[PDB]
Design a protein around this ligand. Sequence first.
Ligand SMILES: CC(C)(COP(=O)(O)OP(=O)(O)OC[C@H]1O[C@@H](n2cnc3c(N)ncnc32)[C@H](O)[C@@H]1OP(=O)(O)O)[C@@H](O)C(=O)NCCC(=O)NCCS
Ligand SMILES: CC(C)(COP(=O)(O)OP(=O)(O)OC[C@H]1O[C@@H](n2cnc3c(N)ncnc32)[C@H](O)[C@@H]1OP(=O)(O)O)[C@@H](O)C(=O)NCCC(=O)NCCS
Ligand SMILES: CC(C)(COP(=O)(O)OP(=O)(O)OC[C@H]1O[C@@H](n2cnc3c(N)ncnc32)[C@H](O)[C@@H]1OP(=O)(O)O)[C@@H](O)C(=O)NCCC(=O)NCCS
Ligand SMILES: CC(C)(COP(=O)(O)OP(=O)(O)OC[C@H]1O[C@@H](n2cnc3c(N)ncnc32)[C@H](O)[C@@H]1OP(=O)(O)O)[C@@H](O)C(=O)NCCC(=O)NCCS
Ligand SMILES: CC(C)(COP(=O)(O)OP(=O)(O)OC[C@H]1O[C@@H](n2cnc3c(N)ncnc32)[C@H](O)[C@@H]1OP(=O)(O)O)[C@@H](O)C(=O)NCCC(=O)NCCS
Ligand SMILES: CC(C)(COP(=O)(O)OP(=O)(O)OC[C@H]1O[C@@H](n2cnc3c(N)ncnc32)[C@H](O)[C@@H]1OP(=O)(O)O)[C@@H](O)C(=O)NCCC(=O)NCCS
Ligand SMILES: CC(C)(COP(=O)(O)OP(=O)(O)OC[C@H]1O[C@@H](n2cnc3c(N)ncnc32)[C@H](O)[C@@H]1OP(=O)(O)O)[C@@H](O)C(=O)NCCC(=O)NCCS
Ligand SMILES: CC(C)(COP(=O)(O)OP(=O)(O)OC[C@H]1O[C@@H](n2cnc3c(N)ncnc32)[C@H](O)[C@@H]1OP(=O)(O)O)[C@@H](O)C(=O)NCCC(=O)NCCS
Ligand SMILES: CC(C)(COP(=O)(O)OP(=O)(O)OC[C@H]1O[C@@H](n2cnc3c(N)ncnc32)[C@H](O)[C@@H]1OP(=O)(O)O)[C@@H](O)C(=O)NCCC(=O)NCCS
Ligand SMILES: CC(C)(COP(=O)(O)OP(=O)(O)OC[C@H]1O[C@@H](n2cnc3c(N)ncnc32)[C@H](O)[C@@H]1OP(=O)(O)O)[C@@H](O)C(=O)NCCC(=O)NCCS
Ligand SMILES: CC(C)(COP(=O)(O)OP(=O)(O)OC[C@H]1O[C@@H](n2cnc3c(N)ncnc32)[C@H](O)[C@@H]1OP(=O)(O)O)[C@H](O)C(=O)NCCC(=O)NCCS
Ligand SMILES: CC(C)(COP(=O)(O)OP(=O)(O)OC[C@H]1O[C@@H](n2cnc3c(N)ncnc32)[C@H](O)[C@@H]1OP(=O)(O)O)[C@H](O)C(=O)NCCC(=O)NCCS
Ligand SMILES: Cc1cc2nc3c(=O)[nH]c(=O)nc-3n(C[C@H](O)[C@H](O)[C@H](O)COP(=O)(O)O)c2cc1C
Ligand SMILES: Cc1cc2nc3c(=O)[nH]c(=O)nc-3n(C[C@H](O)[C@H](O)[C@H](O)COP(=O)(O)O)c2cc1C
Ligand SMILES: [Cl-]
Ligand code: NA
Lengths: 68, 67, 66, 67, 66, 67, 68, 67, 67, 67, 67, 67
Amino acid sequence: GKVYKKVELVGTSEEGLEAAIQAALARARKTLRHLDFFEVKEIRGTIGEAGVKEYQVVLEVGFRLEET
Amino acid sequence: GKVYKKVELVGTSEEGLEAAIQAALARARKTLRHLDFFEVKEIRGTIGEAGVKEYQVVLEVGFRLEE
Amino acid sequence: GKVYKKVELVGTSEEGLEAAIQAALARARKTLRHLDFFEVKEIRGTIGEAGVKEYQVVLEVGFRLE
Amino acid sequence: GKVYKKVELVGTSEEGLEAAIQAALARARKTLRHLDFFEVKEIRGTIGEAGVKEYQVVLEVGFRLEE
Amino acid sequence: GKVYKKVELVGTSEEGLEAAIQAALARARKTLRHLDFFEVKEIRGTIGEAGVKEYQVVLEVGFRLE
Amino acid sequence: GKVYKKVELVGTSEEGLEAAIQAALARARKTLRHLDFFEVKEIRGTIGEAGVKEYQVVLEVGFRLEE
Amino acid sequence: GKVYKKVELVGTSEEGLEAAIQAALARARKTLRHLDFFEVKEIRGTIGEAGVKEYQVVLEVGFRLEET
Amino acid sequence: GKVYKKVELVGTSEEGLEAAIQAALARARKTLRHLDFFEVKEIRGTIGEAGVKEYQVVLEVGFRLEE
Amino acid sequence: GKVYKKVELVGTSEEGLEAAIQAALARARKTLRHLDFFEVKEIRGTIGEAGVKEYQVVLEVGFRLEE
Amino acid sequence: GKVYKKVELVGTSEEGLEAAIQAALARARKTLRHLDFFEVKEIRGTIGEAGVKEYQVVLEVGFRLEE
Amino acid sequence: GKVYKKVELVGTSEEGLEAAIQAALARARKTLRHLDFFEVKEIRGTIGEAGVKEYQVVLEVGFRLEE
Amino acid sequence: GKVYKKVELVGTSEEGLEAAIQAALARARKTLRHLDFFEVKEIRGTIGEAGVKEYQVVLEVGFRLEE
Ligand SMILES: CC(C)(COP(=O)(O)OP(=O)(O)OC[C@H]1O[C@@H](n2cnc3c(N)ncnc32)[C@H](O)[C@@H]1OP(=O)(O)O)[C@@H](O)C(=O)NCCC(=O)NCCS
Ligand SMILES: CC(C)(COP(=O)(O)OP(=O)(O)OC[C@H]1O[C@@H](n2cnc3c(N)ncnc32)[C@H](O)[C@@H]1OP(=O)(O)O)[C@@H](O)C(=O)NCCC(=O)NCCS
Ligand SMILES: CC(C)(COP(=O)(O)OP(=O)(O)OC[C@H]1O[C@@H](n2cnc3c(N)ncnc32)[C@H](O)[C@@H]1OP(=O)(O)O)[C@@H](O)C(=O)NCCC(=O)NCCS
Ligand SMILES: CC(C)(COP(=O)(O)OP(=O)(O)OC[C@H]1O[C@@H](n2cnc3c(N)ncnc32)[C@H](O)[C@@H]1OP(=O)(O)O)[C@@H](O)C(=O)NCCC(=O)NCCS
Ligand SMILES: CC(C)(COP(=O)(O)OP(=O)(O)OC[C@H]1O[C@@H](n2cnc3c(N)ncnc32)[C@H](O)[C@@H]1OP(=O)(O)O)[C@@H](O)C(=O)NCCC(=O)NCCS
Ligand SMILES: CC(C)(COP(=O)(O)OP(=O)(O)OC[C@H]1O[C@@H](n2cnc3c(N)ncnc32)[C@H](O)[C@@H]1OP(=O)(O)O)[C@@H](O)C(=O)NCCC(=O)NCCS
Ligand SMILES: CC(C)(COP(=O)(O)OP(=O)(O)OC[C@H]1O[C@@H](n2cnc3c(N)ncnc32)[C@H](O)[C@@H]1OP(=O)(O)O)[C@@H](O)C(=O)NCCC(=O)NCCS
Ligand SMILES: CC(C)(COP(=O)(O)OP(=O)(O)OC[C@H]1O[C@@H](n2cnc3c(N)ncnc32)[C@H](O)[C@@H]1OP(=O)(O)O)[C@@H](O)C(=O)NCCC(=O)NCCS
Ligand SMILES: CC(C)(COP(=O)(O)OP(=O)(O)OC[C@H]1O[C@@H](n2cnc3c(N)ncnc32)[C@H](O)[C@@H]1OP(=O)(O)O)[C@@H](O)C(=O)NCCC(=O)NCCS
Ligand SMILES: CC(C)(COP(=O)(O)OP(=O)(O)OC[C@H]1O[C@@H](n2cnc3c(N)ncnc32)[C@H](O)[C@@H]1OP(=O)(O)O)[C@@H](O)C(=O)NCCC(=O)NCCS
Ligand SMILES: CC(C)(COP(=O)(O)OP(=O)(O)OC[C@H]1O[C@@H](n2cnc3c(N)ncnc32)[C@H](O)[C@@H]1OP(=O)(O)O)[C@H](O)C(=O)NCCC(=O)NCCS
Ligand SMILES: CC(C)(COP(=O)(O)OP(=O)(O)OC[C@H]1O[C@@H](n2cnc3c(N)ncnc32)[C@H](O)[C@@H]1OP(=O)(O)O)[C@H](O)C(=O)NCCC(=O)NCCS
Ligand SMILES: Cc1cc2nc3c(=O)[nH]c(=O)nc-3n(C[C@H](O)[C@H](O)[C@H](O)COP(=O)(O)O)c2cc1C
Ligand SMILES: Cc1cc2nc3c(=O)[nH]c(=O)nc-3n(C[C@H](O)[C@H](O)[C@H](O)COP(=O)(O)O)c2cc1C
Ligand SMILES: [Cl-]
Ligand code: NA
């Protein structure tokens, strides 16, 4: 019928969760076409002297494979 | 004695995660009483030309059954 | 080699998820040294008249043991 | 063929686990027909001065949709 | 934005897995508007003389709340 | 060294959870030796006239293999 | 009360999913009595020239232990 | 605002499930204040000549942190 | 010494479940060699006029890496 | 077509992980034919004076049924 | 009855998996009494010039609470 | 900020678990730059005349994406 591929990316940001998700998808958009959906798998991060240093969101990203 | 019900909702927002959760709870508040707690089950969404198009937060919402 | 301990905390905030996470880490920082990493286990909360009353983020917090 | 619905209920009791389960089903019985099976999803509770204050059993309850 | 509700149904059939899924959705459409998607949660069933007696497919069904 | 075998049993009882567990273990004891440990995998059951009809505890039972 | 035993089988078939499930239950009934319920744990398989080579359905099968 | 901590305890009892849970909570309150909620993570145990020897209930216990 | 790669694909089809799986594998076969095994991760789909519109099978596909 | 059975074994060893897995398989080999594959479900063990006393590897072991 | 506590440690080693487990238990042994059992939760690590740089084993360690 | 990709590899070895892990990473470093971390997802394998024929370690390998 149709075929999609999913790739597992980790987006990171010092700002917040949305920014980390957006960083992953902004990079995905540079090389992948027909990006349709995503699913958050994990939220983790690193700690520094101010609390969160880096948010890291592990994301599956689904895109439709071109037939032609 | 007391009994609670949980319903599975999906709140959506183009703005962010908190807004998505709030959308679901805003809608629940119009028809349901004694809403007590929620649990996020998953965070999903759609992708558009500018990154995230829609955040979709799947929530379970618990409320006390009256009477 | 090195050994880390993980403790399960729940940070709360009326304003958002990042704020809830930061609350947990801010409290951890008062008594724990060599805080390194965190993992969100669950997002929960309470409901009030204006929707979300409290965001409650269940976190694992990893720190290096001296 | 036949179709069932499952509803997620939380039964509570200050007495025990069985009593919390029975509280959920006792309430379900007041308004739902053809209740058939249940599955425990979670056992939770609250703590008080004397230990457990309330047992809280999260249950999936299945009933056959009639006609 | 939009809000969706998910309901957990179990479709059954003696014919097969597809028929089981269709039974739940056929019943769902008799009362629910704006049905959009489904997610299979598990496949179970009963055993008889001939092998499978009936297939039972536990489904979550999403629809938009109007 | 030692090797253990785990087998999955379901005990049932109309009385309670402990009774269901004990039923599975009583049966295991009739034919197996060196029964050491158990792990509850799920709690399910049936619904009758007065709430719970049958408690059904799915149990993994571990025993040390002889030789 | 009653006691059931569950066993984990893998039914295989080149035809389809139902056929793989049926293969397990058919073998089960050759030696086991009072077979009552099954639960699919996973659907796996092998790949060949024509796509799916073999469907492999991992199944839990429950039967009532006889008392006499 | 508030910060809570969860500890994983295993309550045990030769009597039953509720007793194992209560045993964990009774010990917790000897030293911990602001004990609020618990969540059962698993039910395990040992087997003896009469079936269950000891029930072992793995429990997360949540309490509010002071200061 | 030898190494395999797994890739997560979603096959879709309006016919049925097997057709969805075969769709993903047929495509994989056009550009990948040494395809060996698959594992179904989930079954999802869309709803239309007459019940199921599209079956969507999420599949991991494992293949041997050359050299 | 072919039918396989999977049994859950716990291999143990005071030396290491691979030794514990090999212990389970060495035992399986004494009474079962067409042993094909294994799946590690869990790594557990006991603690002694010098750290690990015994490794205990919970394995599923699959074999093809004859006839 | 008795009450146990479980703590989650991450043992690390450049050598191997058993070494990482042992590093965690060695540190546990310095300050904790009645260490009884462990459960491996995760195996992960870092990558360097020669492949694995450090193995990291996330472990639950159970000990009996004294007194 | 930075973006990483995770790929699922299966490393194999007749020697042991660490060798299987190292086989996957050895292959990875021939074609991928900025390899950072790994997570073991599953330990599987095959059985032969002498017990374990082949250890197969299913690994997620994470690497930083360029530019
Ligand atoms: C290294 C890597 C991260 C780089 O990804 P990238 O920046 O997107 O670079 P790519 O070369 O993959 O570019 C995207 C390709 O997808 C194609 N493409 C984009 N969208 C597509 C779609 N919807 N359908 C089909 N093709 C599409 C592009 O045309 C391009 O191919 P082309 O250069 O032939 O035109 C990625 O290639 C990768 O993860 N490879 C797998 C590595 C691996 O697992 N190695 C084994 C280690 S042991
Ligand atoms: C009660 C509790 C929440 C208080 O935590 P706290 O606010 O961090 O206070 P603590 O006394 O633990 O202070 C932190 C300690 O860790 C030490 N420490 C901080 N970082 C460390 C590190 N990286 N490595 C080693 N030690 C460290 C501090 O020096 C301090 O010890 P000290 O007072 O001897 O100098 C916490 O101790 C706890 O959860 N314990 C409960 C135990 C339990 O589960 N009880 C059993 C019930 S059945
Ligand atoms: C009993 C039950 C299975 C019957 O379901 P049903 O056949 O669909 O019958 P319902 O009336 O509930 O469903 C149709 C309703 O949904 C409404 N509806 C349909 N699609 C809708 C949509 N997309 N958005 C909003 N409402 C919608 C219909 O208008 C109708 O409501 P109305 O009578 O006010 O007009 C169902 O009501 C149920 O599972 N609820 C039981 C509640 C429960 O859990 N009991 C508590 C036990 S303790
Ligand atoms: C509010 C609520 C807790 C009340 O539950 P309740 O006490 O069972 O009340 P119900 O109206 O569902 O009563 C049971 C209904 O199911 C019907 N019914 C009972 N058993 C049935 C069966 N086996 N098959 C079909 N219908 C059945 C009854 O006829 C009755 O409907 P009717 O009065 O229209 O004839 C429950 O309906 C609910 O959880 N719905 C909330 C919907 C929701 O999720 N809100 C959206 C928020 S965004
Ligand atoms: C059918 C079944 C439930 C009957 O169970 P049961 O009542 O315990 O009867 P068993 O024949 O297994 O008897 C237990 C045997 O194990 C022996 N045994 C008891 N404890 C033991 C131990 N710790 N170590 C080794 N052997 C032991 C007993 O002495 C007896 O052997 P024996 O009769 O040769 O003396 C059980 O054998 C079973 O589930 N078999 C698997 C069937 C199956 O999967 N079929 C495939 C269908 S596709
Ligand atoms: C060993 C252990 C079980 C003893 O538990 P315990 O009997 O409850 O002892 P604690 O020191 O934690 O006692 C509770 C302390 O927290 C305080 N406290 C109690 N409730 C509190 C709360 N809600 N908020 C903050 N502090 C609290 C008590 O006043 C007491 O402090 P005090 O010593 O000043 O009187 C426990 O400390 C433990 O599990 N420690 C972790 C061990 C570990 O992981 N070590 C590293 C191994 S590598
Ligand atoms: C876009 C995409 C789906 C296209 O896949 P495709 O149609 O199979 O095309 P690919 O080039 O990737 O795959 C075929 C290649 O694999 C090779 N190949 C096939 N089987 C192989 C095997 N067993 N071992 C090694 N290589 C093999 C083929 O020879 C071909 O390479 P070549 O052109 O150099 O000869 C795929 O490249 C992809 O998903 N890339 C990842 C994108 C990504 O994650 N980017 C990062 C975004 S942030
Ligand atoms: C007790 C037990 C551990 C002993 O196992 P064992 O040492 O391998 O001995 P078994 O007799 O069971 O198995 C060996 C037999 O399997 C047969 N066998 C071996 N490989 C086979 C294959 N691939 N296909 C079919 N049969 C095979 C052999 O013929 C052999 O001898 P047989 O001719 O007498 O049947 C095991 O039988 C068991 O766990 N039984 C289940 C007990 C149970 O669950 N009881 C219910 C308690 S409530
Ligand atoms: C900081 C930390 C790693 C240090 O661990 P440590 O090196 O093992 O030192 P601890 O004090 O925790 O543990 C040793 C204590 O437990 C006692 N103890 C050891 N084994 C015991 C057992 N089986 N039963 C009861 N007590 C025991 C020791 O006697 C000692 O207490 P003492 O000083 O009164 O003699 C640990 O205390 C910890 O993780 N604390 C929790 C901090 C926390 O979560 N704070 C909240 C931040 S928001
Ligand atoms: C076939 C496959 C296993 C071969 O992997 P491989 O041996 O690593 O070969 P690649 O072609 O991917 O080589 C690595 C590429 O990534 C680039 N790369 C390496 N590290 C990188 C990094 N950190 N960031 C960006 N790019 C990187 C390399 O420069 C090289 O690209 P180049 O040839 O343009 O220089 C792999 O490409 C694959 O699994 N493809 C996906 C197949 C697929 O899903 N097809 C769809 C089937 S329906
Ligand atoms: C379509 C649907 C979502 C509409 O939800 P809704 O917008 O909340 O509309 P409702 O009719 O359920 O309104 C809420 C009801 O719950 C009642 N209610 C609110 N809070 C309550 C509480 N805490 N305790 C008991 N009842 C409560 C309200 O009084 C109202 O009932 P009333 O009209 O008798 O006064 C629908 O309720 C639903 O999803 N039900 C199940 C549909 C289903 O699964 N059908 C089977 C298909 S196969
Ligand atoms: C090899 C094996 C697959 C053969 O299975 P099988 O073809 O069904 O052969 P069995 O010998 O088990 O025959 C079924 C038995 O269950 C009995 N049985 C069938 N249904 C029953 C039921 N409902 N209640 C009680 N007993 C029943 C049959 O009568 C027969 O026993 P009997 O020969 O004493 O009359 C075997 O059953 C097995 O998997 N055993 C476990 C092997 C094992 O784990 N060994 C340890 C390895 S380290
Ligand atoms: C991790 C992994 C999982 C596998 N799962 C299955 C399986 O589900 N069913 C099956 O028949 N074979 C399975 N196999 C075996 C492969 O399909 C294949 O036959 C074997 O790896 C030999 O492949 P090769 O000739 O490409 O090296 C699996 C192999 C690996 C490494
Ligand atoms: C459900 C299942 C899982 C399997 N998993 C693996 C695997 O983990 N690794 C592997 O190399 N082969 C795997 N296989 C392949 C078997 O090891 C075996 O080689 C194959 O089933 C051929 O079986 P037979 O020779 O007994 O007929 C798997 C097969 C099945 C049916
Ligand atoms: Cl068996
Ligand atoms: Na032991």
